[PDB]
Amino acid sequence: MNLRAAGPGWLFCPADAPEAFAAAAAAADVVILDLEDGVAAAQKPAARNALRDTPLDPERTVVRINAGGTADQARDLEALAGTAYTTVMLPKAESAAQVIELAPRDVIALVETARGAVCAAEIAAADPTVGMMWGAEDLIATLGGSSSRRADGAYRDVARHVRSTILLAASAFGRLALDAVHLDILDVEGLQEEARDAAAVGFDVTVCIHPSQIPVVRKAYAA
Amino acid sequence: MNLRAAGPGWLFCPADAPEAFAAAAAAADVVILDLEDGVAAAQKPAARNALRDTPLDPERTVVRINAGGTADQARDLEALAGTAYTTVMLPKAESAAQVIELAPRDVIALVETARGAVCAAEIAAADPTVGMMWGAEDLIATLGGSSSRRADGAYRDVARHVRSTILLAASAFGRLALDAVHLDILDVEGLQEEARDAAAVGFDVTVCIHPSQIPVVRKAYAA
Amino acid sequence: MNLRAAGPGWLFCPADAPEAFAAAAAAADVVILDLEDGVAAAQKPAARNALRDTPLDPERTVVRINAGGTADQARDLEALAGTAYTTVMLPKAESAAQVIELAPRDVIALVETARGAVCAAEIAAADPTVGMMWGAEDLIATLGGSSSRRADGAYRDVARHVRSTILLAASAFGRLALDAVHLDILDVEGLQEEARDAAAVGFDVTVCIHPSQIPVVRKAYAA
User: Fold this and answer.
1) Any known ligand binding at C64?
2) Dihedral of the CA atoms C126, C130, C134, C139 (nearest 10)?
């Protein structure tokens, strides 16, 4: 894809909700159709049919698949064979090997565990990689913690550490850098603060979970 | 050991003070009997006899030995042969090789130098490792600095950087993560702040230097 | 050189301004004569003649050359052959290989790109390296960003992350650690804050762009 030519506003859309695909695509620069956490276990088969029967522009759509080694991932790759999509987002990306095994597709590696952070440069360097993203929620969960943000709302240090790690790793290997979702959708002040910072430090994209976030991201990345 | 089954409150006890061993063990989840800085050069021989003649429960006790390559470390390992202890804490841990050479014992690697930080993942991955700890005092000392904390009491950036480095490295390799000692014992406010943060980001343990710290650690790690 | 014996106040002096070399050397502990950004494309040939015809004490002077693989770097190394200088500062240092290729000279590697940060330990370990420096301006520029500092004047997280990375990498390999320039020359409050922090965490040097900065650096590093 020409991912860098598309704007900074990427938007997750659960793949079991095809009646929303068209609105997502007109609201966003790029849509991430999601087969992992946006979709309940029981509705994943249905998401996979929707992925095949309701297409979006493949130059502006990526698919978030399930994690390395899972049965769900194998079922997802089977469903993708029926589409025109070329670019997948790998959750819980923990090794170069997990990226390589997705060739010949392009991969955005979403690093949200300790192992992924420690191996960030190896992941970024892997031949299929075209982008690196980070997520604070599952990072804190898999570390054994309870809260990604302190009381005043700033990320805790380890999240801030991983953020920089992934920005550097992506940029060292010429990859797109994607900043993490702002989970408090109505907190537009917080999102503006993060997206302006993201833009200023050289993130390419801030990923969004609701269409209302897109304008604020696009404005933050203006100059 | 089943270190994860024991609580979050670990407590250093100088090994030259056997009259205190029993009180330490009833106050703490785990006791670290110390052969390094808690004991003066001249009293180390005596600590080593105390280590042999006054035993603690080996399921709930670890021994802090001296650093790699030192004569003191060799004398410590000789004294440990006479005990039931299985798990040692290696100060100034700087390489996988320093951990490997302690096999077949289990090792908590205490990283408190630049080299240890740079090599954190290699240290964490080493087969004997069961835990990773960090210490800010000797990190700053060996870097050539003078102060681990700024005027408002927060750690300086490099300490905060090492903290996250060791949390990630431990968690990437399935190891226990131990947060650094709060040296200002009477500053219970500061300890509560650090331990609640430690718990929230997935530290398993906060290490203590005085029995009064244990309750505050155990409460911070509650939920 | 005996770089550690010289003071903490290093000062850049554009190499096209030889009428200023003597004043720079009396104002500073060490002078960095600059062939890269302090000198415009058209004046570089002239800088190189000045470097040869107006000598400074080689025990107290280093030369900032141009980047790896550039024609300018090759012209710089040709000009240096005519001098008594032994120690060069490599901008945009990105690999051990870029340092090795400068042997047998001593090298201060100035890390100011993502690749340099990711490869910091490899760079520090390289045999010619005697020092590591970082720069926030070109780090942010090459990452694709616009601002190294937030509104309240603190560095953005990625700069703070690289700072610590380079301090650790230098110290892990016994190298001098050089803290980044304070670009707002008249902001002596900001420089004092950074230099006192630098000194406290074990930086050896804070690099300066104007002679007025030297006293404030030397006082910050006192004890």
Assistant:
1) yes
2) -30
- In angstroms, what separates the C-alpha of B162 from chain C's closest C-alpha? 9
Residues in chain A whose beta carbon is closer than 8 A to a beta carbon of chain C? 121, 160-161, 163-165, 167-172, 177, 197, 199-202, 204, 223
> Residue B85: phi, psi to the nearest 5?
-75, 140
Distance from CA of A163 to the nearest CA of B (A): 12
Which of C61, C104, C56, C107 is CA-nearest to residue C81?
A: C104
Say yes or no: domain C1-223 is CATH 3.30.420.40. Answer: no
Spatial distance between the Cα atoms of A151 and A140, rounded to a whole number of angstroms: 15
Nearest chain A residue (CA) to B202: A145
Domain boundaries, chain C: 1-223
Asked whether the beta carbons of C53 and C89 are under 8 A apart, the reply is no
CA nearest to B56, candidates B89, B103, B15: B15
> Which residues, including other chains, have CB under 8 Å from residue C191's CB and lie 6 or more apart?
C182, C184, C206, C213, C216, C217
| Stated resolution in angstroms | 1.9
Packed helices B188-201 and A136-143: angle between N→C axes, nearest 10 degrees: 100
The answer to whether B204 contacts A144, with C-beta atoms less than 8 Å apart, is yes
Among all chains, which residue has been given the structure tokens 């309240």? C152
Those residues with Cβ within 8 angstroms of residue A161's Cβ, 6 or more apart along the chain or in another chain? A117, B161, B164, B165, B168, C161
Q: Method of determination? A: X-ray
